[PDB]
Symmetry: D2
Subunit: 192 residues, 4 copies
């Protein structure tokens, strides 16, 4: 009912302004059963999750760089450019709490996809007409990740737990980002 191969295929498909965010909708639509949720609760789950979903996503892409953040539109963002925009401590957290920990454990794209789908299927999102179906859906994803983890990393019994315990850090960084981060301060547009 929730195959890892479908979730893996959602991650790969998607691999001013504005705008892409369309690429989040295209991602969500390929996650089993998301599309047969009511349209209202889909919007809810996307609006509630977009921020942590983006952070998870660019943090995993930054696993394959140097010492900063590889963002969405092929833009490599560095520590000093962050410490410049006023967002250095947040950027630090992304690097130490997410980027470094994904890199240290060699977290793959199936694992990334499942963690994001758990984030996406959030049964605490307010305005949900049927939280229980969303909850049921989260339950199938983490069952799938637990089986995948036990089948591909049989010598790492703590791995499932280790993945899930990256989610409070993601939530906290998400809240902090909303309160501050994510910029084009390079503006720059001097009209004199």
């Amino acid at each position: 009912d929730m195959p890892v191969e479908r979730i893996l295929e959602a991650e790969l498909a998607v691999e001013a302004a504005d705008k892409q965010l369309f690429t989040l909708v295209e991602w969500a639509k390929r996650i089993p059963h998301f599309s047969d949720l009511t349209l209202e609760d889909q919007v809810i789950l996307l609006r509630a999750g977009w921020n942590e979903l983006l952070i998870a996503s660019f943090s995993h892409r930054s696993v394959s760089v140097q010492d900063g953040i590889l963002l969405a539109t092929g833009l490599h963002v560095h520590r000093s450019s962050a410490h410049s925009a006023g967002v250095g401590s947040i950027f630090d957290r992304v690097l130490t709490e997410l980027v470094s920990k994904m890199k240290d454990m060699q977290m793959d794209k199936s694992e990334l996809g499942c963690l994001r789908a758990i984030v996406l299927f959030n049964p605490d999102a307010k305005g949900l007409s049927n939280p229980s179906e969303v909850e049921t859906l989260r339950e199938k994803v983490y069952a799938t990740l637990e089986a995948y983890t036990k089948q591909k990393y049989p010598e790492q019994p703590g791995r499932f737990a280790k993945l899930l315990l990256r989610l409070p850090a993601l939530r906290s960084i998400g809240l902090k980002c909303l309160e501050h981060l994510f910029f084009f301060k390079l503006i720059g547009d001097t009209p004199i």
Copy 2:
């Protein structure tokens, strides 16, 4: 040296979905005496620091013209209920009681608004200035000029100069609270449907 007449011309010159009017704001700042004579980096520091309070002051005063609600630069008129069911009704009410309501009570004009907006703009406490002295000095010239105007124009109102200056804490207060976004058109058009 810092003539009200030019400050008034600065306001009247700019009188006049990602349209976001940094253009009019810059147009306006360049028309304020002695601003374009500052280090260009310092002019950027001031427009970035004052942007939010300057917009709020603008749309508050143009909202004196109407029965209730807030008029925005696009021609978008927003009422209490459109704010309450958008979760920013508190800050909306504070704009009305603390700013709109008061500008109309005292019947504050464009010369007075311009001078207050110019005081806001010439902010010596703005982080990263190369010469805060050049800015503090220009600020003193605006309120010297504004106090005089108030004696000229409203001789029967001795406290009017102070009354003007005392709207500025509220505006700063409201400016900071609007940094909960207070952008009144929030996406949500979706397809949603495709492949």
Copy 3:
């Protein structure tokens, strides 16, 4: 290394207005190996965690009662008083995201203590001399939680994950609380 019985004992041992959350220090000292950490790190971990630890604690205490919150000085606050105080939004997150989920799954004291121990042993806390050690201790607590969960609730194979999935919510509610809630004053200003 990290016996559940000892974590339970920490929990059982700790069962106008100031001080008194000296029960957090008493509790932390009774968690295996926490006292073998550097004094500076013990302080760091307590300061980074006190907020989540107190919330986890009074949520679990509030599982029995109507639809409110019980504080370990017998102070009992209902939904209506929180909303009147202007903290109704966060109070309702507490009730719906924590209390009502602890009740429904019948989270027990050993599960609570392990969750609080996981929160205590935070390798992401800023200032730590050795994150790695706090990290190993965290790995020990959750291995113990998982085993306990399979031993006592073998019919609920996803109970372990479901417990770990209360932690994002607890972190979120802990931050949201730092925008203020307390014992509840009051304004008897002479």
Copy 4:
């Protein structure tokens, strides 16, 4: 009706665990002409709304006597180092540059301070006031008195009155930042070999 002496008298009367301490704020407000002439529910409204700015104004001016830290009501001289470790460094810098140094520069006196603090007290935009126009009248008597004192005591300085009032926006905004964290601190001395 609103004499500077009676406002300076208020400042000097209160000059003179845990605590708070801020019993000096209530006793200060009592001695401000006509404050007690208000309904007791408005007196609570004005105080709860003003308290942080009143406190910040107090300790900023008290810090005019020292070299470069903050001097608190008891003796607590706070220096940049113990602030910049309590995670309230940037706010401390703002207190120094926007309030303390400007008060030092212009030699702001205790009658000026008392008047600004009374202006902060009589906030007619305070949520919940039952007679907000009486509060505004009182504020206006405070700023007429302060302008008159200013022209008497500083004939060389014509823009002194405006200068004082132009410190209030910085106090308002530093007040918001403080409410959200400052003033509280800060153990370390809870490490228990107990």
